[PDB]
Structure 1
């Protein structure tokens, strides 16, 4: 049975099926809630919008990222985003697919513990696994040796690898990324 790949990131969810060449779904990792009143009776008001539906209605919503610096700081919103990713974007049943999540290095243990608990309980995945982003980047580059500088929306980190051996004492993690550049701009 095929497996799912769910690179979460702090600014964009990229999900797909293990074996493809590119993520099947790429949407913002964002949850919006209406701030204004709501007058048209019967318009069918939703409580919250996720993904890029919240991006087109963003004029009336207040947007929130459930991931600040690689750390998930709102587990309800993250559960909403995962539910969306599985049912509305990929349109699968999580009970029939092992899931490969991804995480940045040097971030709290409770993050991975809650990730796996959420998966196994409120999604009933058959199995899962949590990889490191830099190792996967090196896989994609077609190498077994190199220092990879990953820089997403929340966190920048270097991981030096040699012959497939990591040097965990030389991993350096920095906490300015796309979002801090957006704020500075």
Structure 2
């Protein structure tokens, strides 16, 4: 029988979208000129301390200026005789001595020598040549030592008028013009469920599930490592599995019926999603 693969169409294949660099170095100084023109009390620098993407900008705009990972990397070249240290998206993921400010699997900052350089990159690329208030995000039920160390880096290292911590999902609640509801927010590190009663979070009974997008990426990496069993000739990074999850995964409506008849021969050509490699 030649029928099940004779009239079968040629495949439509998708390449690998690995999180590479991007050719931009802006020293944006047009924000301070607009920030010094506003009256006082209405100028503040807002930093979303996201585990996947730290964001930062000024409050009187709509899009954030900087959106970088917490990746940094430092080097010393003996063939050149110079110490390098660049951070953020400027790391290419050819050299990698990458260590992240967030602990892998939990949105609690415990790698402060990385977080200091990340904030350094933020204040450089925003433009600081000299004292603005800081609104900064954190995780739900944060450990006190992490908040103490973050406040110590804000006051002692840089020098700031004031800073204030908040939960970013509750900020997205307050921007979405809700009053009383049940905010379910699935982040990169953990999935929180927070009940809010008249613009007030009931944090005595919020529950965080210990699963997230990083766990998606790591579990996807483990299942592609165990599916292709006899050895796959290719570098299986975590980030390329994350970009596979971003554009090739969907939550099925009725799972136990969809699953058991999924690998049938009749129609597998349209369920299957295929990925090249160079």
SS in 2 for 1:64: coil
What is the distance in 1 between the residues matched to 2:69 and 2:101? 11
* Contact residue 134 and residue 159 of structure 1 kept, 8 A: no
Q: How does 1:48-63 map to 2 (within 5 A)?
A: 48-54=85-91, 56=92, 58-63=93-98
Please state which structure has a larger fraction of its residues in strand: 1
* Contact residue 74 and residue 83 of structure 2 kept, 8 A: no
1:157 corresponds to: 192
* Contact residue 136 and residue 164 of structure 2 kept, 8 A: yes
What do the CA deviations read for 1:33-90 (whole angstroms, capped 9, x no partner)? Answer: 45xx956436x551x3210111x2x431132211121111111111010011111x21
1:79 aligned onto 2:120: no
* Contact residue 11 and residue 65 of structure 1 kept, 8 A: no
SS in 2 for 1:158: strand
Question: Highest CA radius of gyration, 1 or 2?
Answer: 2
Structure 1 pair 156–81 and aligned structure 2 pair: CA distance change class (3 A): same
What is the distance in 1 between the residues matched to 2:64 and 2:195? 26
Structure 2 regions of 5+ residues with no counterpart? Answer: 1-39, 221-278
Which of 59, 80, 85 in structure 2 is aligned with 1:41?
A: 80
2:151 corresponds to: 116
Structure 1 regions of 5+ residues with no counterpart? Answer: none
1:19 aligned onto 2:60: yes
Distance apart, 1:105 and its partner CA: 0.9
Distance apart, 1:169 and its partner CA: 2.5
Distance apart, 1:165 and its partner CA: 2.2
SS in 1 for 2:211: coil
What is the distance in 2 between the residues matched to 1:183 and 1:169? 31
Distance apart, 1:155 and its partner CA: 2.1
CA RMSD, 1 decimal: 1.9
What is the distance in 2 between the residues matched to 1:99 and 1:161? 25
* Contact residue 70 and residue 114 of structure 2 kept, 8 A: no
1:91 corresponds to: 127
1:136 aligned onto 2:175: no
Structure 1 pair 127–64 and aligned structure 2 pair: CA distance change class (3 A): same
SS in 1 for 2:98: strand
Distance apart, 1:152 and its partner CA: 2.4
SS in 1 for 2:63: coil
Which of 104, 110, 126 in structure 1 is aligned with 2:161?
A: 126
Total equivalences in the alignment: 177
* Contact residue 110 and residue 146 of structure 2 kept, 8 A: no
Under a length normalisation based on structure 2, what TM-score does the superposition of the two structures give? 0.59
